[PDB]
């Protein structure tokens, strides 16, 4: 289990991308009233 699942932090991917604020065009209330069931 040596090289298997190193839970470390890696240098070039720490800022490889950037997030997005709104993201999903739905609402989270639309998620809840989408899969209530």
């Amino acid at each position: 289990k040596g090289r298997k699942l190193n839970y470390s932090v890696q240098d070039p991917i720490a800022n490889y991308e950037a997030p997005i604020t709104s993201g999903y065009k739905w609402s989270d209330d639309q998620i809840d009233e989408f899969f209530a069931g």
Partner: protein, 338 residues
């Protein structure tokens, strides 16, 4: 004028087939489209050019510029690939047959990391930026591109998963397992929401679901199998489905929608030898795309009616449908030759 195969009252064309006066009336679209005797996986980027085709022996990356009709480069990667995605333009992430993951850049090979078990599929999340990678066993991992950490891997069932996909407009994480359960996780909560089971009427042997897909309405889900049987799903009475046996039926690998061009409610299914296309709400075949060799997978270019396969021969086939749509702006005399 390129020849057309017979079909149900409809026409398709191939460019760069196994057969494709002919030398002096050549109809070659993309120069140097041939690999080392097979093809792994082809997909077209989000913008209007720069398609990427993974390699076969000494496997490469093969980015083709559509506005130059030829090859840009071929980064001979270290191992043979199975699955990758493209992250806009120049960045892309890959995983090979061994449990390693490459990050290609403009300079190429920005990093090589690993996952602890052998992986089978990769998808990227546009929202908060964590790639989900499906592998063998209890383990569906994350590599977040925010801060490069690892995340608390998603606890699966026994054997594993053949394909993972997230929904686009709302984010519903699919994971096609082996024991017919589809294991929908929530990309918000990091927990399960449902464990939907897949049924049939023939039941040859305990099939495994191999292809998962969604579209940009966020309400339906296209499901596959290891038997050649397409499935549709909705939340509306989610226990049954509509099914599609295919006339040869080995393993369907690519099921993709037509949710961004005209001639709507249509979907492409693709198993090992044939790729067909049918309509929703009836289940009747619009057309089919029978080549002269097997298919490793396919892809469909957005906005227009053309398809790009990755197969087991030396070139790759492109399939043009002059009834689904036109040929794109960089191929804007295909409608003049045929």
């Amino acid at each position: 004028v390129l020849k057309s195969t017979s079909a149900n009252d409809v026409s398709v064309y191939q460019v760069s087939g196994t057969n494709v006066l002919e030398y002096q009336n050549r109809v070659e679209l993309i120069q140097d489209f041939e690999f080392s005797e097979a093809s792994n996986k082809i997909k077209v980027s989000r913008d209007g050019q720069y398609c990427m085709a993974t390699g076969t022996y000494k496997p490469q990356i093969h980015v083709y510029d559509f506005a130059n009709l030829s090859l840009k480069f071929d980064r001979h990667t270290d191992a043979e690939n199975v699955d990758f995605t493209i992250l806009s333009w120049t960045k892309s992430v890959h995983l090979q047959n061994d449990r390693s993951i490459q990050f290609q850049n403009k300079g190429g090979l920005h990093y090589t990391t690993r996952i602890p078990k052998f992986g089978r599929s990769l998808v990227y999340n546009k929202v908060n930026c964590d790639l989900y990678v499906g592998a063998s066993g209890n383990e569906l991992y994350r590599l977040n591109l925010e801060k490069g950490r690892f995340l608390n891997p998603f606890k699966l069932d026994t054997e594993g998963v053949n394909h993972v996909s997230i929904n686009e407009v709302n984010g519903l994480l699919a994971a096609g397992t082996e024991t017919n359960v589809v294991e929908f996780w929530d990309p918000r909560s990091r927990s399960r929401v449902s464990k939907l089971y897949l049924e049939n009427n023939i039941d040859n042997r305990p099939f495994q679901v191999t292809t998962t897909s969604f579209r940009n309405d966020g309400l339906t889900f296209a499901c596959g199998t290891s038997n050649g049987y397409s499935y549709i799903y909705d939340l509306r009475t989610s226990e049954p489905s509509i099914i599609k046996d295919q006339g040869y039926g080995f393993d369907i690998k690519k099921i993709i929608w037509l949710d961004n061009v005209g001639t709507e409610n249509k979907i492409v299914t693709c198993d090992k030898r044939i790729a067909k296309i049918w309509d929703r709400l009836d289940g009747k075949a619009y057309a089919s795309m029978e080549p002269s060799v097997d298919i490793n997978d396919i892809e469909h270019v957005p906005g227009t009616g053309m398809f790009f396969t990755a197969n087991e021969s030396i070139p790759m086939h492109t399939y043009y449908i002059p009834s689904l749509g036109p040929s794109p702006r960089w191929c804007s005399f295909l409608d003049s030759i045929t």
